[PDB]
Amino acid sequence: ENFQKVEKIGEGTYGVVYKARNKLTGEVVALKKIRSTAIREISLLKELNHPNIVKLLDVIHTENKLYLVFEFLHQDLKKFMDASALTGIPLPLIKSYLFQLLQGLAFCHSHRVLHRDLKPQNLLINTEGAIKLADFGLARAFGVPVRTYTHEVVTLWYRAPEILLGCKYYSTAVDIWSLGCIFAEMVTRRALFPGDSEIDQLFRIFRTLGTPDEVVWPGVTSMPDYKPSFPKWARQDFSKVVPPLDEDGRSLLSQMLHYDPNKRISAKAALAHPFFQDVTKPVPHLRL
C-alpha cells in the first residue's frame, strides 16, 4: 500500500496500532486500523489541532475498514511510569506534564470536545518534555464497548463516578476526574482506584472519598444506578491518599476529584491553581 509497517505498537479498544512509514513522504506515523455518523465526526477531529493533542493527520475509509493516521510519539505514559517506578517521576516533571495536559483539555473543552476515556496509555511523550493527549474524541464516535477488539478488558480505573452511576449526559468534568486519577498515580506510583468491575470501581471510590450523599452531591440519590443499599463509608484524608504530595498539590487534586461534576474544577481554572506557580518544562530521560 502507501505505508511500510515497521512494527505493531499495540492493540486497544477499537483496533490495532502500527508504526509505519509513508513511502511517498518518508513521514513516520502511527496507523490505527479500526474494527456513517462516525465518519463525519472523526473527520471533524482533523481540525482540532493543539501542541498537546496528538495530531490526527488523515482519515481513510475504504472497504468497510477505517484507518486513522496519527502523529507518532515514541513512548506512552504507562511505559514511562513503569520505567520510573524505582525512583518515581520527579515532581517538576509531574507538574509540567499535568500543566500541559490541562492546557490540552482546556483547548478541547472550549471547542466542546470530550475525551471520555483518558488513561496513561492515551498520553504520549517525546524527548523534548512534551506530553500529548491521544485518541481524543474517538469514544463519542464509536461508543465504548464492554470488551475490547482483541478480547481484552476495558479499564475502568479512570472512570468518573457520574458515568458509573449511569448519568447519560456527562460533561467535560469526566476528563478532569480521569486526569486527577492519573496525577495521583504519577505521585504515588500505584493506581488510585484499580477497580476490576463496575461496582468494585465505584466502591473503591466510595471507600476513599466517602459514599456520596445529597450534602456533597445534590441529585446523587436520584441517579439511574444509585442504590440506597450502597454501604456508607467515611471519607479519608488526602494526606493519606497521596501522602508525599504537598498542600498545593493535594488542594488541586481534591478539586479535580470533587464528586459533583458541576463543582469539579475546570481545566481552565486548574491552570490558575497555585500548584503551578513554579511550573517549568524539564526533559525526561527516555531510553528508546
Ligand SMILES: Nc1ncnc2c1ncn2[C@@H]1O[C@H](COP(=O)(O)OP(=O)(O)OP(=O)(O)O)[C@@H](O)[C@H]1O
Ligand atoms: N500516535 C501514537 N504514537 C505512538 N504510539 C501510539 C500512538 N497511538 C497509540 N499508540 C500506542 O499503541 C498502543 C495501542 O494503542 P490503542 O489506542 O489501540 O490502545 P489503548 O491506548 O491501550 O486503548 P484505547 O483503544 O482505549 O485508546 C498503546 O500503547 C498506545 O499508547
Ligand SMILES: [Mg+2]
Ligand atoms: Mg489509545
